[PDB]
């Protein structure tokens, strides 16, 4: 009984780590940042649109 | 989409008053790079 158990949890563990990347937290968090930052600059660009289009 | 927008379309009384903006800013210009020539010197 004890090894049934164990094993069911080292079965679970390995399909959470497997599933990381997409799926915690952690590194969907990272993801999100990286997009804030690009639309930000992308609207800056919009604003100043005639300025840059005159130089 | 915005962006790409834009690039493809635009980046891909007396007749005396323009004359006073463009005098006024080309003299401006003018000033700021002399000194800044002299600065580096």
Do not use: W
């Not at chain 1, 004890?2 to 915690?24: M, P, Y």
């Amino acid at each position: 009984a004890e090894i049934n158990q164990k094993s069911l949890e080292l079965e679970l563990l390995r399909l959470e780590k497997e599933t990381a990347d997409i799926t915690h937290p952690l590194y969907l968090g990272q993801k999100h940042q990286a997009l804030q930052a690009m639309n930000s600059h992308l609207e800056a660009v919009l604003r100043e649109k005639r300025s840059l289009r005159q130089r | 989409i915005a962006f790409n927008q834009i690039y493809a379309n635009e980046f891909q009384m007396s007749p005396m008053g323009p004359f006073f903006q463009f005098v006024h800013q080309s003299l401006s210009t003018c000033f700021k790079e002399l000194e800044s020539i002299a600065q580096f010197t």
